[PDB]
Amino acid sequence: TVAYIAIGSNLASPLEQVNAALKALGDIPESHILTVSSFYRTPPLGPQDQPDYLNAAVALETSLAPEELLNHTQRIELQQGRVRKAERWGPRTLALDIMLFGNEVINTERLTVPHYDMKNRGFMLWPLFEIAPELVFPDGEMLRQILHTRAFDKLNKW
């Protein structure tokens, strides 16, 4: 199954954390990285004192069940990052999100796939579009169409 995973880091110097996370993703049992998007820099909207995020998308081939994959991404979050005691704004220093999991639709207590809010997030859509411009969602929506309908500002590279 090809799963698409979004990575976000809000560290001031996020490169080493992102690399540790990438290596960890490739180390997941029965899985390996097919492709990684460029690293993108995404703004603090409104309040400026917020730091830039590094965002990227990863295509991961995996034979694991979706919930097993989630187990691993959550483990990697716990191992490679921390929870900011500030607010809900920036929850964790490292965020791993399962955007798509093959052509599967998932709606459980633990897992909503396609990711529940990804169509609202340019920082998820643009890096994904770089590595999968032809992507079609399980319901037939098209990544290209979502970007064509909404007009999200392009992201600069890290």
What is the C-alpha to C-alpha distance for residues 97 and 57, in angstroms, rounded to an integer?
Answer: 9
Mind giving me the DSSP string for 112-137? EES-TTGGG-HHHHHHHHHH-TT-B-
Site for ligand APC in 113-142 (CB under 6 A): 113, 115
- Find the part of the chain contacting ligand APC (CB under 6 A) among 9-17, 41-49, 108-116, 138-146: 108-116
Question: Is 58 a residue that touches ligand APC (CB under 6 A)?
Answer: no
3-state secondary structure of 146: helix
Site for Cl ion in 101-120 (CB under 5 A): 101, 104, 113
What is the C-alpha to C-alpha distance for residues 6 and 59, in angstroms, rounded to an integer?
Answer: 9
| Closest CB to ligand APC among residues 45, 148 | 45
Of the candidates 82, 65, 60, the residue with the CA atom closest to the CA atom of residue 5: 60
Residue nearest to Cl ion (CB): 100
Question: Is 100 a residue that touches Cl ion (CB under 5 A)?
Answer: yes
Site for ligand APC, rule CB under 6 A? 91, 97-98, 110-113, 115
